[PDB]
């Protein structure tokens, strides 16, 4: 649908965004506490959901999705506010 969290949990969250099976090569998720140990991970293009996990309950966290295309280019898929 859009880039937004589906299932939310005190230790992890499920994020989702509109699939693409012609243009993306992999997605790259990136996430850390707000302002202030950055973390990221990588998902293949065919997928369109991802499981961020092992978070600190109650703590605010800026998430972001990023995409690398077939033309070896880099772009971010929107940007989302997340704070407990």
């Amino acid at each position: 649908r859009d880039l937004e969290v589906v299932v939310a949990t005190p230790t992890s969250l499920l994020i989702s965004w509109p699939a693409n099976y012609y243009n993306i090569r992999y997605y790259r998720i990136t996430y850390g506490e707000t302002g202030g140990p950055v973390q990221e991970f990588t998902v293949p293009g065919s997928k369109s959901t991802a499981t961020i996990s092992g978070l600190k309950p109650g703590v605010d966290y800026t998430i972001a999705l990023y995409a690398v295309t077939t033309r070896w280019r880099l772009y971010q898929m929107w940007q989302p506010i997340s704070i407990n």
């Binding site: 880039l3 509109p18 693409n20 012609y22 243009n23 993306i24 077939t70 772009y75 898929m77 940007q79």
Partner: protein
């Protein structure tokens, strides 16, 4: 390369945006799955040209690639796939449709 449609000329302050599901220019000779693309304030005043997904100067942009002066419009029912069958305009062998939008579609202030 030429935008199949004509421009939305901005005459104010807030830039071009569209509530979700609004923004696709009307085109009766096009299928529901082809209803998708982007407005790019292109290269005075700002003017936003419509280009379909996978066509135009930014034809390698995924849908949702956050750039500047590009916005993504898609109608409920469209597919996330390229418009090779539609392509763009060639201003010699055709002229530009006047970009119309259905009824009820909202437009920012200073857009007509």
């Amino acid at each position: 390369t030429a935008s199949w449609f004509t421009a939305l000329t901005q005459h104010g302050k807030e830039d071009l945006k569209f509530p979700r599901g609004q923004g696709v220019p009307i085109n009766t000779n096009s299928s529901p799955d082809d209803q998708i693309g982007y407005y790019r304030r292109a290269t005075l005043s700002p003017r936003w040209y419509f280009y379909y997904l996978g066509t135009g100067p930014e034809a390698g942009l995924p849908y949702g690639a956050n750039k500047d002066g590009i916005i993504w419009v898609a109608t409920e029912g469209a597919l996330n796939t390229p418009k090779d069958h539609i392509g763009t305009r060639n201003p010699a062998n055709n002229a530009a449709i006047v970009l119309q939008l259905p009824q009820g579609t909202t437009l920012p202030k200073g857009f007509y």
